[PDB]
């Protein structure tokens, strides 16, 4: 199916002394492959997946250079944005940046993205066509004029449409044993009674990859959203994900309810029902 490569970066200022805390993470789909933490002892981009360990010194040197450059740009930015917003030197502020590319089943470029935020709010982002920018306020508009004059969009577009895609294909090929493998959810239903007239049915999906999944309930073959609770998809910690969906039902009527599970690893969606 589809794939993506995305990098996330977070810089938090330390106004009383020193440089900001900078954490960078890179993903292929739902798999973390590299990380950089300014508080770590290596001061190097580090591997987080076995398939990236085969890259040589040249690659690690390159990634470390580029990531340090990203941290210094955020360092400067924190000061520049502090001024744009007339803020004092006493508080801690955050800059977040996320960029990457999506590809289709054929591995060809689908779309690219580059978003930047200040204190958790939109700041500036590249538009879908990758040729212009969306600035949320007048400070971000000052950045947009800088970026237009320095032709930043052109540079990014070339990276997003080309380089990003090329590296994503290299990674999918090198990590094929896991990256190109889909792990279907292991499903089961549990039952719980709170009183003599009400019961809860919980449909579980475990050990799946990728994270995208759809869990839905039906009553007599009709979709049912009322009286349902769906938890956020969560990581199991071994690279797979979990999620559950519950429906509250009149005790004794459990057999009318069915859980439906949709996932890339299932050649056909599955249905679960509670037996007596």
Partner 1 sequence: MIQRTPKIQVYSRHPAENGKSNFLNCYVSGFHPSDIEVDLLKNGERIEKVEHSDLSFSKDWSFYLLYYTEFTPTEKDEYACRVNHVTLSQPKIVKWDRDM
Partner 2 sequence: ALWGPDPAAA
Which CB sits closer to partner 2, 80 or 178? 80
Token pair listed for 203 = 């449909």
Which CB sits closer to partner 2, 143 or 216? 143
User: Tell me, what DSSP letter sits at residue 175?
Assistant: T
Q: Choose the binding region for partner 1 from 133-141, 158-166, 228-236, 254-262 (rule: CB under 8 A).
A: 228-236
Q: Are 5 and 164 in contact (CB under 8 A)?
A: yes
What torsion, rounded to 10 degrees, do the Cα atoms 113, 116, 117, 118 define?
180
Q: How far is the CB of 69 from partner 1 (least distance, A)?
A: 19
Q: How far is the CB of 75 from partner 1 (least distance, A)?
A: 16
Please list, in sequence order, all residues whose beta carbon lies within 8 angstroms of the beta carbon of residue 13, skipping any fewer than 6 positions away: 20, 78, 82, 91, 92, 93, 94
Q: Which of 253, 237, 261 minimizes the C-alpha distance to 189?
A: 261
Q: Choose the binding region for partner 2 from 142-150, 187-195, 212-220, 245-253 (rule: CB under 8 A).
A: 142-150
Which CB sits closer to partner 1, 158 or 231? 231
Q: Considering the rule CB under 8 A, would residue 38 count as an interface residue with partner 1? A: no
Which CB sits closer to partner 1, 98 or 169? 98
Residues 221-235 as b or e (16 or more Cβ within 10 Å = b): eeebeeebebeebee
Residues in 126-145 at the binding interface with partner 1, rule: CB under 8 A: none
Q: How far is the CB of 114 from partner 2 (least distance, A)?
A: 8
CA dist list (Å): 185 to 43, 202, 205, 263: 38, 15, 5, 8
> Binding residues for partner 1, per CB under 8 A?
8, 10, 12, 23, 25, 32, 35, 37, 48, 92, 94, 96, 98, 117-122, 190, 192, 202, 206, 231-232, 234-238, 242, 244
């Amino acid at each position: 199916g589809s794939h993506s490569m995305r990098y996330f970066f977070t810089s938090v200022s330390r106004p009383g002394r020193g440089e900001p805390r900078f954490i960078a993470v890179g993903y292929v789909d739902d798999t973390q492959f590299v990380r950089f933490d300014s508080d770590a002892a290596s001061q190097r981009m580090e591997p987080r997946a076995p398939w990236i360990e085969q890259e040589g010194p040249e690659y690690w040197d390159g990634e470390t250079r580029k990531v340090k450059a990203h941290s210094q740009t955020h360092r400067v930015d924190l000061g520049t944005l502090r001024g744009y917003y007339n803020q004092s030197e006493a508080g801690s502020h955050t800059v977040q940046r996320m960029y990457g590319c999506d590809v289709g089943s054929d591995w060809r470029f689908l779309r690219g993205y580059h978003q930047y935020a200040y204190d958790g709010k939109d700041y500036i982002a590249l538009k879908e066509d990758l040729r212009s920018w969306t600035a949320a306020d007048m400070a971000a508009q000052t950045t947009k004029h800088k970026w237009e004059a320095a032709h930043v969009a052109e540079q990014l577009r070339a990276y997003l449409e080309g380089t990003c895609v090329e590296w994503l294909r290299r990674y999918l090929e090198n990590g094929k044993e896991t990256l190109q493998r889909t792990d279907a959810p292991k499903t089961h239903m549990t039952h719980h009674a709170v009183s003599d007239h009400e019961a809860t049915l919980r449909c579980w999906a475990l050990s799946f990859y990728p994270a995208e999944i759809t869990l839905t309930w039906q009553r007599d073959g009709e979709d049912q959203t009322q009286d349902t609770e769906l938890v956020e998809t969560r990581p199991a910690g071994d690279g797979t994900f979990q999620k559950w969906a519950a429906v509250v039902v009149p005790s004794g009527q459990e057999q009318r309810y069915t859980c439906h599970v949709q996932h890339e690893g299932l050649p056909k969606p599955l249905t679960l029902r509670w037996e007596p």
